[PDB]
């Protein structure tokens with residue numbers, strides 16, 4: 001590959017007829033989009049309390065650093081256009097679990113929360129009822145404008 | 147068609163093979179002396195001393211055609227060997243395969259003055275002084291690219 | 303002696319930086335030296351697929367992934383610098399064309415023009431950090447002394 005291909009199908013390859021490899025040498029690739037943030041407990045499928053999974057357990061995201069740009073990026077990732085608002089409090093529910101203190105610093109111009117610069121080290125504790133939420137527009141054709 | 151280029155002679159140089167209207171090279175992967183024997187005897191150059199790799203005679207400008215030559219040294223053509231197939235290669239031009247054959251001949255003077263030496267069959271060697279006419283000395287000096295005439299001198 | 307900022311750092315899988323790792327909130331508190339963390343990172347360069355630990359194919363870590371060194375301009379000086387970097391004795395042989403087997407990941411280094419006395423392979427001049435025209439069939443190897 002030249003690195004600029006859209007799919008591996010477009011990559012030129014060099015097959016070898018002889019033996020290839022052993023299964024003890026299979027390749028594994030780690031990409032940067034590992035966030036795994038979803039929307040739960042909403043009337044329409046793609047709005048509700050923001051729920052994030054790290055350390056093998058789901059959790060609710062704090063609203064202290066949940067600006068409208070973070071909501072916009074999350075809505076773009078879930079393919080529901082822009083974010084109408086971020087309802088504070090437990091409008092969609094406090095969530096059965098612990099609160100994740102991740103501080104996403106999205107500028108609102110990226111289409112995935114994994115592209116956002118997230119800071120979670122030593123983040124300040126969050127009140128239980130102060131759980132972040134988002135109400136996406138729901139229109140895929142709707143796009144963010146500056 | 148098969149040819150050797152940038153070899154400084156007739157029986158040496160990077161192996162250029164012809165296919166699909168373009169002159170392409172051969173990758174030096176598993177390019178041992180058995181592969182060199184086939185191309186040297188195919189070109190009427192006798193046996194082979196070196197099966198050079200890593201673009202010894204310069205990097206060619208053309209599509210690498212063959213990758214894994216498994217010649218037994220008995221077939222009369224290079225393309226009759228067992229290979230990966232035309233175009234099937236995982237090589238670059240930095241590792242083009244060239245050969246140095248038995249009939250490759252080179253001339254040098256070692257001290258443009260010094261003992262006349264001729265490179266045949268892969269080994270350097272001197273040239274007899276007997277019946278060394280002036281024309282032969284002129285030919286030798288001209289072939290070294292430094293004169294048109296010369297004088298026979300005793301050894302230092 | 304300096305205070306402790308953060309404690310209970312729990313890195314998930316995926317972050318390549320510590321600040322995406324959740325932990326307890328920042329607190330400026332005094333810390334005894336016993337309960338601070340002292341970590342020794344593993345060696346930058348390892349030898350793989352060798353009969354012993356001092357011989358095998360040269361693997362180097364950079365850019366997040368383990369890589370290899372191509373055999374172009376891979377003389378015995380490069381083997382000497384690799385052997386003295388790993389802590390093994392003097393070099394014996396500098397193999398070429400993947401004598402010990404094809405490597406892993408990308409090809410970080412090729413044409414390493416070491417003088418044989420550098421402190422590490424990184425100070426050695428080369429076409430560094432990828433974009434090398436070599437394939438994985440040309441992985442360089444060494445043979446040090448036990």
Ligand SMILES: *[C@@H]1O[C@H](CO)[C@@H](O)[C@H](O)[C@H]1NC(C)=O
Pocket residue numbers: 195196198
């Ligand atoms: C050819 O092979 C001989 C045999 O050892 C070697 O001495 C000589 O250096 C080689 N020459 C080239 C150009 O590879």
Ligand SMILES: *[C@@H]1O[C@H](CO)[C@@H](O)[C@H](O)[C@H]1NC(C)=O
Pocket residue numbers: 357394395445446
């Ligand atoms: C490495 O060097 C040792 C010491 O002579 C030798 O026994 C061993 O066979 C060498 N390994 C290779 C792969 O040549």
Ligand SMILES: [Ca+2]
Pocket residue numbers: 065066067070103104105106
């Ligand atoms: Ca934010």
Ligand SMILES: [Ca+2]
Pocket residue numbers: 175213214236237439
């Ligand atoms: Ca090959």
Ligand SMILES: [Ca+2]
Pocket residue numbers: 174175199200241
């Ligand atoms: Ca090669």
Ligand SMILES: [Ca+2]
Pocket residue numbers: 176177178180181214215216217
């Ligand atoms: Ca062969």
Ligand SMILES: [Ca+2]
Pocket residue numbers: 373374399440
């Ligand atoms: Ca090479």
Ligand SMILES: [Ca+2]
Pocket residue numbers: 375376377379380413414415416
């Ligand atoms: Ca070198």
